[PDB]
């Protein structure tokens, strides 16, 4: 009931705090995944 709701809130508050603390990591990973190069197009790593 109320106790479980408080427990879930206690779980999620530091969870969101850590998620915000890794904001740069999340942004970097998302940019790696989506991969939108608008103007700088890698031609290819040469040997």
């Amino acid at each position: 009931i109320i106790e479980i709701i408080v427990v879930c809130a206690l779980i999620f508050f530091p969870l969101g705090y850590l998620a915000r603390h890794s904001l740069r990591r999340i942004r970097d990973t998302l940019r790696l995944f989506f991969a939108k190069p608008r103007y700088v197009k890698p031609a290819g790593t040469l040997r």
């Binding site: 790696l32 608008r38 197009k41 890698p42 790593t45």
Partner: protein, 162 residues
Amino acid sequence: VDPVFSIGISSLWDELRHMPAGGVWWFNVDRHEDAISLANQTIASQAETAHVAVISMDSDPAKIFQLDDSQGPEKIKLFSMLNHEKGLYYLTRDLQCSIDPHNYLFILVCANNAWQNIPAERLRSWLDKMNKWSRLNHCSLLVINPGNNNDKQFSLLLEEYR
């Protein structure tokens, strides 16, 4: 911990040659062919484990940038950008989407008089952003600009010595 990179000049003292990771160094050349030769020599003069990449304009980098078969890193990343201000502005985000800049080197060989159309205030803001990004990512950036009328640009670079 982060290794230091070297400029491609033979018989040069390490005081003016060594470059720590996490900063920006600016180079101007009288001729674009001098820029290409210096870029090739810098590529050939880096360590095997060094992460170095080249970005050029108005050409295909695969045919104008080479490596020495006896010296230099095993492989480098080649990147091509449009000859426009937006390419330079987005460079950071594009490389972040492409390469993890930690312990990694930029060599930006621009076209002839490529830095002539960039306004002063925007150039200062871009340089500040590049320096902050270099410090944050511990990445080193080198820019080679073939130009003849960059005296005002040289003064601007002097004013942003910080």
